[PDB]
């Protein structure tokens, strides 16, 4: 009974939680990359204000 309970219940929930956390972290990293791109664009635009 314990073997069946663990195998059919306990593991898939942990796996789903792991899969959710990975997606959240990846999304945050992608947003950080976008912000870094914008600040680099502003930095390059600053130098051309008066050559």
């Amino acid at each position: 009974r314990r073997v069946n309970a663990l195998e059919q219940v306990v593991i898939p929930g942990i796996r789903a939680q792991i899969r959710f956390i990975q997606q959240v972290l990846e999304q945050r990293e992608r947003e950080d990359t976008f912000r870094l791109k914008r600040i680099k664009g502003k930095i390059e635009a600053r130098e051309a204000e008066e050559e």
Binding site: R1, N4, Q8, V9, Q23, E26, Q27, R30, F34, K37
Partner: protein, 468 residues
């Protein structure tokens, strides 16, 4: 009409190129790009301003140079030349014939983006379609004017199900007494990102059925330019709308593997440095998908209709992925396949619990199919859900703590999954399916049928199984 060329190219990078003095290019226009070797490319204006105009190229930018490239205007809005002679032809998604026959003569030239239908001009879909599948016709019935996609996995046979539905579709006018004639039926098949091994199957199935004489095929292959995948469903929907609302055809549109369309849209969006969405996808997919799905329906005062059956493969069978999630919020139901039923040889592997049809309640009933349909569907859903729950309980505890009621519910579940779902290549009428459904409900005792009124259990209850 005269032509105008622009040679002031100032910047080329990736898919974009800038034209300096093009102040008379309309927003969203189609341009024609020529290089020094004579090869001709296409493109679209995505931004126009006084200082420059931005043009994205439909395919790769190899071989372009600032010295010899010129840009020529084609038309202010992307249009498709449609005709009644397009039936039986094949096209490559951008509109050119690939069957070797001469091109068509357009009766009209229609914008491919379409226009929204006025909600006042619409009318309610109410004509029930008999598809020959018990799990569809009884519990997820399809109505003329509905958009009902199929949620599939990787190795599941969604395409065979779509072909079988296309073969067996009929309207059954006798149940409402609506004469004998058939208003002509048509099929528009659009394939995005399809492979040759798969495309050959659809070609052979259409040839064997003989439905190629009343069908239009738009084919976009995996090695084609990525932009041509975006334009493919829009032209198919334009042709379907033209036929249905100007020649009174009853068309059926099949869009295959819209996951390829969504990945192509992600590529195009990420190529222009935009803020991404849930999983890297663009944040405007909902509008882009709504501009495709919402073109079906029925119009007051007209005889034609458009019916959509999109097909999409769920990535890693995840129902919370952005593509199935955004498809669910727009379309009116879905048919979801199950890998567990496919593993044990059941065909078609349609799973009743995650399946849904929103237009069922106004396409069936008294005077449409018969009186007892709606209550039978509810009773089947409730009893099968209880059986699945009890079966889930058994797999942890074991087959020793079950009351005879729970044993009856398990018997109902395992008899259902065999007799009702698995039918093979059969073609079942609605009466046969309802007789089978009443046969299954007879295994439960009378007092538990709370969903059904006492008149109907006094009429149809008591029939035995007939798989003998």
């Amino acid at each position: 009409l005269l032509k105008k060329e622009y040679t002031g190219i100032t910047y080329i990078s990736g898919p974009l190129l800038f034209v300096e003095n093009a102040k008379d290019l309309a927003y969203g226009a189609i341009v024609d790009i020529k290089d020094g070797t004579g090869r001709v490319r296409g493109g679209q204006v995505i931004e126009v301003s006084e200082e420059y105009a931005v043009i994205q190229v439909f395919e790769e930018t190899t071989g372009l140079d600032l010295a010899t490239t010129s840009v020529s205007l084609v038309e202010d809005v992307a249009r498709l030349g449609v005709s009644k002679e397009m039936l039986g032809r094949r096209f490559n998604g951008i509109g050119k014939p690939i069957d070797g026959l001469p091109p068509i003569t357009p009766e009209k030239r229609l914008p491919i983006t379409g226009l929204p239908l006025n909600p006042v001009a619409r009318r309610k879909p109410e004509q029930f379609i008999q598809t020959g599948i018990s799990t569809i016709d009884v519990m997820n019935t399809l109505v003329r004017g509905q958009k009902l996609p199929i949620f599939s996995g990787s190795g599941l046979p969604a395409n065979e199900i779509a072909a079988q539905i296309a073969r067996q579709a009929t309207v059954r006018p006798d149940l409402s007494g609506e004469g004998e004639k058939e208003e002509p039926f048509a099929v528009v098949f659009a394939a995005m990102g399809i492979t040759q091994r798969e495309l050959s199957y659809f070609i052979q199935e259409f040839e064997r059925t003989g439905a190629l004489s009343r069908s239009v095929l738009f084919l976009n292959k995996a090695d084609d330019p990525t932009i041509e995948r975006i334009l493919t469903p829009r032209m198919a929907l334009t042709v379907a709308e033209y036929l249905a609302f100007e020649h009174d055809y009853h068309v059926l549109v099949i869009l295959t593997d819209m996951t390829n369309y969504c990945e192509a849209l992600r590529e195009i969006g990420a190529a222009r440095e935009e803020i991404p969405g849930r999983r890297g996808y663009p944040g405007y997919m909902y509008t882009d998908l709504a501009t495709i799905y919402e073109r079906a329906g029925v119009v007051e005062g007209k005889k034609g209709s458009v019916t959509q059956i999109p097909i999409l493969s769920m990535p890693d069978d995840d129902r919370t992925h952005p593509i199935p999630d955004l498809t669910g919020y727009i379309t009116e139901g879905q048919i979801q396949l199950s890998r567990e039923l496919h593993r044990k040889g059941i065909y078609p592997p349609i799973d009743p619990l995650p399946s849904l049809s929103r237009l069922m309640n106004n396409g069936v009933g008294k005077g449409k199919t018969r009186e007892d349909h709606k209550q039978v569907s509810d009773q089947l859903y409730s009893a099968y859900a209880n059986g699945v729950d009890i079966r889930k309980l058994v797999a942890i505890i074991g087959e020793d703590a079950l009351t005879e009621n729970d044993r009856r519910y398990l018997q109902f579940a395992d008899a259902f999954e065999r007799f009702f779902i698995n039918q093979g290549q059969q073609n079942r009428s609605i009466e046969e399916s309802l007789q089978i459904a009443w046969a299954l409900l007879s295994m439960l005792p009378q007092g538990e049928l709370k969903r059904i009124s006492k008149d109907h259990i006094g009429k149809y209850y008591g029939q035995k199984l007939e798989e003998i």
